[PDB]
Amino acid sequence: CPEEIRDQLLDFHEDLMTHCGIELDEDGSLDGSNDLTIR
């Protein structure tokens, strides 16, 4: 089976939110605070 047991590969779909673009779109996908306690 794929890496994601649930449906497809990662986070319900890829090429969507944060992961297949990281050069500045992970930076944009981390919009602000309340993402982790390290902030």
Side-chain angles (χ1 to χ4, degrees):
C1 273
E3 189 174 357
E4 166 183 354
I5 53 168
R6 284 191 285 89
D7 50 68
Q8 188 253 351
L9 280 172
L10 281 175
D11 315 310
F12 309 76
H13 182 235
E14 279 282 299
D15 313 70
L16 162 72
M17 48 186 213
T18 198
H19 190 65
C20 296
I22 293 175
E23 82 183 12
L24 75 169
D25 301 333
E26 172 58 43
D27 298 299
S29 168
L30 298 145
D31 338 17
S33 316
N34 313 69
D35 200 292
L36 189 53
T37 64
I38 63 177
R39 305 287 283 206

